[PDB]
């Protein structure tokens, strides 16, 4: 579990959005596993605007922040699960690191800000849904 809070936005994994998030929807993309909902209060997160491939992510299954190298956002094959059929997930970055399903929502950060949130994994790999191309998160 976990979310990004920037301005009047809550960014969460689409497969984990609560009923309250759907009743206050801004934008969603099934192919990226992202959903953005409106918030009454202002958030403090700054989104990174860069091409960094090294950062630190939070892993709830180990209660640890791990430094990692990660790939460029890409269309990656994600196996069928209870949340989606077998498909290509876009804007996904992989890293060698421990991750388990309950780790989704963990933030990945670089020196510039929030890069993305855990969305996939397994096999000593962890995948992050990128949010750095969502330039509109920095306005209104
Ligand atoms: N974005 C998605 O479509 C997610 C939805 C939840 C499930 N997804 C994952 O990647 C799972 C592992 C799936 C798996 C298990 C066993 C064998 C082959 C695959 C996972 C593991 C670790 C961290 C986060 C998620 C896909
Ligand atoms: Zn950066």
DSSP string, 73-90: SEEEEE---SSS-SEEEE
Ligand nearest to C-alpha 49: 2
Joined together, the tokens standing for residue 53 give 């491939």
Structure tokens at 17: 């959005």
122 within 8 A of 76, measured Cβ to Cβ? no
Query: For residue 121, which ligand has an atom nearest its CA?
Result: 1
DSSP letter for each residue of 1-50: ---EEEEEEEEEEGGG--HHHHTTEEEEEGGGTEEEEEEEEEEE--B--S
- Determine contact, residues 103/121, Cβ cutoff 8 Å: yes
SS3 70: strand
Active-site residue list: 15, 33, 104
C-alpha 136: how far from chain center: 16
Q: How far apart are CA 136 and CA 140, in angstroms?
A: 8
- Nearest Cα to 89, choosing from 134, 52, 128? 128
Q: Å resolution of this model? A: 1.5
Tokens 């969460």 correspond to 12
Q: How far is the CA of 102 from the centre of ligand 1 (A)?
A: 10
Binding-site residues, ligand 1, Cβ < 6 A: 15, 33, 78-79, 81, 83-84, 89, 99-101, 103-104, 118-122
């Amino acid at each position: 579990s976990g979310a990004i809070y920037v301005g009047n936005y809550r960014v969460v994994n689409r497969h984990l959005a609560t009923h309250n998030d759907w009743a206050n929807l801004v934008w969603e993309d099934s192919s990226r596993d992202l959903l953005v909902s409106s918030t009454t209060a202002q958030g403090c997160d700054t989104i990174a605007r860069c091409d960094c491939q090294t950062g630190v992510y939070y892993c709830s299954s180990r209660r640890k922040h791990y430094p990692v190298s990660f790939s460029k956002p890409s269309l990656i094959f994600v196996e069928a699960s209870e949340y989606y059929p077998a498909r290509y997930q876009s804007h996904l970055m992989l890293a060698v690191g421990h991750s388990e399903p309950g780790d989704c929502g963990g933030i990945l950060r670089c020196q510039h800000g929030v890069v993305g949130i855990v969305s996939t994994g397994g096999n000593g790999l962890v995948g992050f849904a990128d949010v750095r191309d969502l330039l509109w998160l920095d306005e209104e």
